[PDB]
């Protein structure tokens, strides 16, 4: 709860990846300690790959921003058609939530400006010896990231 | 929060000393988005539409009618129209797509039209658009149709099922409109999830993914448009988000097959009804298996349905057939 | 006259963020193609804005 391990996983929530990679190559058995230190090397890697993944599986996900639409709350008496009202709050937890009436977005909105997404395949075969050799057999806790790398690989042979 | 009993003639049937079978069966139940009507359907009984104005349930009994869709065939599902409050698109089993009107001033029900496109073997699925601008009538045997409602009920295009998948004679168990009204999510027999583009009048498939290895029983949608939840004949009930079309949660509570899925209008509780007469509730935003309640139902087949306006709990499952309505269930013990 | 100046500079700052009376945000919806609304970018009418 308190100490170095909380420091080492609060630096991954914001943006600071270069010190944490330098630590976890010195002492690799800093994992098996907290299960939360593997979920935050997955949220960084999911940002660098989501522009890539939506380009190969393009026309499905391009219509899936047209699929992601909400129901409009109508009235019975005068036959109205009204949309929904949300609120935007700021918290300290990195993963996005959505309550009964409000959304919870991360407060530090410029967290990703150090990082850069990459090109088609010749960087994904280069940015994986760095990041995915740290969490080697630990992508089983991030099961969505294991699908998005393999859905690239089937859509790369078909293309 | 108190137990209050539902007052139809099904409670009078069981209260008498009638031995063999008091009501018979329930075929379909659909809500209009206004959240004051009901389409309570039976097998050989009555399709009873309801209109209760202010009280909980003890205000008035509206209408029961056996001879509504005729006297020889049955109705698979009753689609309500989002545009017209007085319109319910009932599709009979063999060859009838009739369109009925209801009257509040009189104890009757009149019919506006009965349109039919020929060589109709068996249409079992009819459902309008969430905005009410299309009607996709889909057979489980040959092909899927597409009509309109805003001008009239006129055909535009149709697609044959064998162009979607290519394995065998597959049955279409359940399909669901998208939430924008622009896509079709259809559920096959061998566990295929195919996505069809239905913008205005063109019907073309986008992609097909292998959800699991069983008949995909139900497909529901989230009112905030983030994800969609599927069911199975296995124990699997995945939660697939829409921006990436991958899986997020897994409800692995494999004690039986899955029959009925519902969500809430806020999108919090997922209600799963299995085949061992056991119901569950879960959470969507929270972790995988975090129950709020489990309830043992009696010996007969129940049904589960959620209101579109406010969270009120409709179950069935009395001694032969009766519905139960649980009032003020924000905590549920 | 300087000790009366900084006393009223604080009262000016205490009237811009901390008391700060706002309008009664009444929702106005015309386009059925947005399906969602946030109550942080509601801009009022121009005949009410130019008076204010």
From Swiss-Prot, chain A:
It is found in: Nucleus. This is THO complex subunit 2. It comes from Saccharomyces cerevisiae (strain ATCC 204508 / S288c) (Baker's yeast). The gene is THO2. Belongs to the THOC2 family. Present with 521 molecules/cell in log phase SD medium. Component the THO subcomplex of the TREX complex, which operates in coupling transcription elongation to mRNA export. The THO complex is recruited to transcribed genes and moves along the gene with the elongating polymerase during transcription. THO is important for stabilizing nascent RNA in the RNA polymerase II elongation complex by preventing formation of DNA:RNA hybrids behind the elongating polymerase. Component of the THO complex, which is composed of HPR1, MFT1, THO2 and THP2. Together with SUB2, TEX1 and YRA1, THO forms the transcription/export (TREX) complex. THO associates with DNA and RNA in vitro. The chain holds residues 401 to 559 of 1597 of the full protein.
UniProtKB/Swiss-Prot annotation, chain B:
GO terms for biological process: mRNA export from nucleus; transcription elongation by RNA polymerase II. WD repeats lie at residues 21-60, 118-157, 167-206, 211-250, 253-292. GO terms for cellular component: THO complex; THO complex part of transcription export complex; transcription export complex. It is found in: Nucleus. Keywords: Nucleus, Repeat, Transcription, Transcription regulation, WD repeat. One of its GO terms (molecular function) is mRNA binding. Belongs to the THOC3 family. Component of the transcription/export (TREX) complex and the THO complex. Component of the TREX complex, which operates in coupling transcription elongation to mRNA export. This is Protein TEX1. The chain holds residues 41 to 373 of 422 of the full protein.
From Swiss-Prot, chain C:
Disulfide bonds: none annotated. It is found in: Nucleus. It comes from Saccharomyces cerevisiae (strain ATCC 204508 / S288c) (Baker's yeast). The gene is THP2. Component of the THO complex, which is composed of HPR1, MFT1, THO2 and THP2. Together with SUB2, TEX1 and YRA1, THO forms the transcription/export (TREX) complex. THO associates with DNA and RNA in vitro. Present with 2840 molecules/cell in log phase SD medium. Component the THO subcomplex of the TREX complex, which operates in coupling transcription elongation to mRNA export. The THO complex is recruited to transcribed genes and moves along the gene with the elongating polymerase during transcription. THO is important for stabilizing nascent RNA in the RNA polymerase II elongation complex by preventing formation of DNA:RNA hybrids behind the elongating polymerase. It comes from the Eukaryota. This is THO complex subunit THP2.
């Amino acid at each position: 709860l308190f100490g170095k391990i909380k420091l080492l996983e609060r630096l991954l929530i914001h943006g600071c990846v270069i010190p944490v990679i330098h630590v976890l190559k010195q002492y690799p058995k800093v994992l098996y300690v907290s299960e939360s230190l593997s979920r935050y090397l997955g949220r960084v890697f999911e940002y660098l790959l989501n522009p890539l993944y939506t380009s190969m599986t393009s026309s499905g996900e391009s219509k899936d921003m047209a699929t992601a639409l909400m129901i409009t709350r109508i009235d019975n008496g005068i036959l109205a058609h009204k949309p929904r009202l949300i609120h935007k709050y700021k918290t300290h937890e990195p993963f996005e939530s959505l309550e009964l009436n409000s959304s919870y977005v991360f407060y530090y909105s410029e967290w990703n400006s150090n990082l850069t997404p990459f090109a088609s395949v010749n960087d994904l075969f280069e940015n994986s010896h760095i990041y995915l050799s740290i969490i080697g057999p630990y992508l089983g806790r991030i099961p969505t990231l294991l699908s998005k790398i393999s859905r690239i690989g089937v859509a790369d042979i078909q293309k | 929060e108190d137990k209050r009993f539902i007052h139809v003639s099904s409670r009078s049937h069981s209260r008498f000393t009638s031995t063999p079978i008091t009501p018979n069966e329930i075929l379909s139940l659909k809500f209009h988005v206004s959240g004051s009507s009901m389409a309570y359907s039976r097998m050989d009984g009555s399709l009873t539409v309801w209109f209760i104005k202010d009280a909980s349930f003890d205000k008035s009994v509206e209408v029961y009618i056996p001879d509504c869709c005729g006297s020889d065939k049955l109705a698979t599902d009753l689609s309500w129209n989002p545009t017209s409050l007085n319109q319910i698109a009932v599709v009979s089993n063999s060859s009838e797509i009739s369109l009925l009107l209801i009257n509040e001033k009189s104890l009757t029900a009149s019919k506006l039209r009965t349109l039919s496109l020929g060589s109709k073997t068996k249409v079992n699925t009819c459902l309008y658009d969430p905005l009410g601008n299309w009607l996709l009538a889909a057979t489980k045997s040959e092909k899927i149709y597409l009509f309109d409602v805003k001008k009239d009920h006129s055909s535009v295009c149709s697609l044959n099922i064998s162009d979607i998948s290519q394995e065998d004679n597959d049955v279409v168990y359940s399909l669901a409109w998208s939430n924008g009204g622009s896509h079709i999510f259809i559920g096959f027999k061998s566990g295929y999830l195919a996505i069809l583009k239905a913008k205005h009048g063109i019907l073309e498939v986008c992609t097909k993914i292998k959800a699991h290895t069983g008949p995909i029983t139900e497909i529901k949608m989230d009112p905030w448009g983030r994800n969609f939840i599927t069911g199975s004949i296995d124990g699997n009930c995945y939660v697939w988000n829409m921006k990436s079309l991958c899986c997020e949660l897994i409800i692995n509570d494999l004690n039986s097959a899955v029959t009925t899925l519902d969500v809430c209008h806020l999108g919090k509780i997922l209600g799963i009804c299995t085949e061992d007469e056991m119901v569950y509730f879960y959470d969507l935003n929270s972790g995988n298996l975090l129950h709020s309640k489990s309830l043992a139902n009696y010996k007969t087949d129940p049904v589960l349905k959620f209101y579109p306006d406010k969270s009120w709990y409709i179950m069935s499952g009395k001694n032969d057939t009766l519905s139960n309505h649980f009032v003020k269930n924000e905590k549920n013990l | 006259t300087f000790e009366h100046l900084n006393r009223d500079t604080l009262r000016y700052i205490n009237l811009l963020k901390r008391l700060s009376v706002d309008l009664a945000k009444q929702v106005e919806v015309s386009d059925p193609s947005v399906t969602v609304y946030e109550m942080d970018k509601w801009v009022p009418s121009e005949k009410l804005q130019g008076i204010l």
